[PDB]
Design a protein around this nucleic acid. Structure first.
Ligand code: ZN
Ligand code: ZN
Ligand code: ZN
Lengths: 152, 155, 157, 156
RNA sequence: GUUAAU
RNA sequence: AGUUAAU
């Protein structure tokens, strides 16, 4: 009668031994919301250093701690580009008044976000061929926008 | 704990430093409804402008029809494809089926459906068509698209 | 956090107006019900993205009107209707309806021929519309009408 | 009127004969939750004996582990692949850090991940793999995974 | 004041 | 010609 906890996380695999509900019509709403988020997560994953996070991997490479190799930093960066969308960014861009230096940085990250969609495999490579000084300011500019869009 | 705002937009990338909740079970319903919409926007995008950004697509098309704001024909054919891909042919067919037959509005309802459909299969070759097509009639196929676009969303 | 009124263009997908639209495009400020319908319009775009007299009818009506040789249907147009209908049925649902009735029963071969079409067509609708464009008109009508009723069976009781 | 039960499960196909709502703007919010789950299940399915249906994939695997129900190795590998695709790597890395250094359980956790990932990339060759492992080693992989599956979902 | 799917 | 957004 209660919603099956496995169904909530995707799909019950316990055949007919399972006496919990698999009928969405019978489910309270929270279970239908929670289930939609595990399912979207699966659907998104199907279309392709751990306690630091991708962010702490990038904050460490800028700062040269925790021995982060440049290769491991462009892989992280690729992941952080996929979490940003270019329209939240184009809204930021056209609230900065004209000729502000901050417009060119905005368009620069957009080109990488867009290049990363088409193919994250060669977008990593275009980043490695950057020299670190400029790679690290690019990295720190996309960090700043990440915190900015999301918090405040 | 409160729901991690990075998680609401996708997936937190802050590792264990982040002490907000990443557990959908604890979240209030609004954060789950919001996250779902950020997530569908992301799924949809992953299967595929010089301060005319303020006009929008619709403002670029309406300035082109009226020959104002320096909207060249090329950038209005591009914008016309954007508009096509946002209409859904089904709710045109809906409207076309509410009219008496041999009303002239029916033949307008089918040029749009052929355009939204030709644009879905090939967005570009459809653009090709649009930019060779004499500005006279393109401007009324645009104004017809733009009227359907509005009326669908006005009840 | 403060509630606003939602852009009804954005509710149906993406607003194309720009800084001219003075309605909310920020989901953090919409009321629950607007977040609920957006998702439904957005799921229809996603699904559509990876797949006049006849629309009056519908697919069931153009299929039903084939059982009575009515409204000048064509075998070609009644088979497209059928695939379109199979892609609407779900392959795990008639496996429920096939594991409840007694063994050596006369309604398992229909099921398993439905199961055998539901997913012989999940692959492509070219080989499966031909797979019945050949089947005889007698067996067609009855086998077209066999899925029609599993369709309303599943959907109501 | 009440929402069309055919549109709840997808796309009503009755044309204009249908006397129920097809307008999401008018629906009670529960029907829109349900429809989304029905459509999520469909979006996801479109990205690819039989009395074993009663058993389900877990029935089938428990059965193999205990030499019950005449379950061939092929059939327990298939089902092990399906069991894998229902697991997500991130949930168990959550636990791999909750462990202590040089536990045994860090060895098992690492191994199922290698299987999830290979199962994602090529599920047909992960099955080919599982069907060459020593029968007893296969069954403990299987038992470990079943147990991870169980407590992922029931252990807060 | 002027704009408005207030 | 007042309440709500935008200037
Ligand atoms: Zn269950
Ligand atoms: Zn808008
Ligand atoms: Zn209906």
């Amino acid at each position: 009668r209660n919603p099956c906890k496995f169904e909530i996380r995707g799909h019950c695999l316990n055949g007919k031994r399972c006496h919990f509900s698999h009928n969405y019509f019978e489910w309270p709403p929270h279970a239908l919301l929670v289930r939609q988020n595990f399912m979207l997560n699966r659907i998104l994953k199907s279309m392709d250093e751990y306690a630091l996070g991708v962010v702490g991997v990038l904050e460490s490479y800028i700062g040269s701690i925790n021995n982060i190799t440049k290769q491991s930093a462009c892989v992280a960066m690729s992941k952080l580009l996929t979490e940003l969308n270019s329209d939240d960014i184009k809204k930021l861009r056209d609230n900065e008044e004209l000729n502000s230096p901050k417009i060119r940085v905005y368009n620069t990250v957009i080109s990488y976000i867009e290049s990363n969609r088409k193919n994250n495999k060669q977008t990593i490579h275009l980043l490695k061929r950057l020299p670190a000084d400029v790679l690290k300011k690019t990295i720190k500019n996309t960090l700043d926008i990440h915190k900015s869009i999301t918090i405040n």
